[PDB]
């Protein structure tokens with residue numbers, strides 16, 4: 259029941275993802291080094307990770323069918339509000355339930371609860387984030403479903419400041435109808451049972467995680483000593 263327009267969308271989002279997410283993590287060496295000892299010892303490294311990942315999210319987003327047809331202003335608001343969410347989503351790819359960590363190929367670039375808690379953010383964020391990663395992993399999404407969810411999350415009609423919501427909604431619905439049809443045609447049961455409803459629920463989980471991150475960013479940002487450890491892009495995207 260997948261239309262050729264729908265199959266074209268899947269094709270585009272898979273390539274867009276493949277072009278902006280390097281599964282070998284080679285670029286992690288360009289980051290300020292990780293420090294495992296020290297309350298902000300991991301901040302430099304993870305700030306660089308986040309900042310790098312913001313760029314990659316933008317690159318993926320520009321390739322979303324219809325995104326280009328949005329105003330510059332609407333592209334800005336959507337990316338500013340979705341960045342940390344898509345970072346959490348795309349991170350599920352390296353997250354492993356084996357030891358509850360983000361395993362990016364090597365021990366230097368393998369981040370657990372202890373590491374992630376040495377960057378100025380509290381368990382109020384980290385605990386439900388890890389829970390989120392586990393709950394997302396268990397959905398065992400097809401990569402097709404994975405890239406559709408990231409794109410749907412980015413093109414959300416209800417983000418603060420969106421001007422032409424209806425168009426944003428038109429774009430998202432096409433992605434949504436692609437996701438729902440894909441699940442019907444390509445995802446065998448029981449893995450498919452209620453899967454769309456479950457993925458859309460992860461988008462609600464992400465709002466909650468976004469809100470809490472926003473709170474904790476404001477806190478830490480209020481100490482220039484901490485803001486100094488970030489990057490210009492991170493400062494511009496999460497608030498300046």
Ligand SMILES: C=C1/C(=C\C=C2/CCC[C@]3(C)[C@@H]([C@@H](C)[C@H](CCO)CCCC)CC[C@@H]23)C[C@@H](O)C[C@@H]1O
Pocket residue numbers: 301304305307308311342345346348349350351352353360362369373374375376377379383384471
């Ligand atoms: C960022 C990514 C990766 C992992 C994600 C992680 C582990 C470290 C902490 C991250 C960045 C979380 C953020 C919110 C951090 C929470 C406290 O350390 C904040 C970092 C401070 C700049 C979200 C996803 C988490 C690795 C790979 O999957 C690529 C992906 O883009």
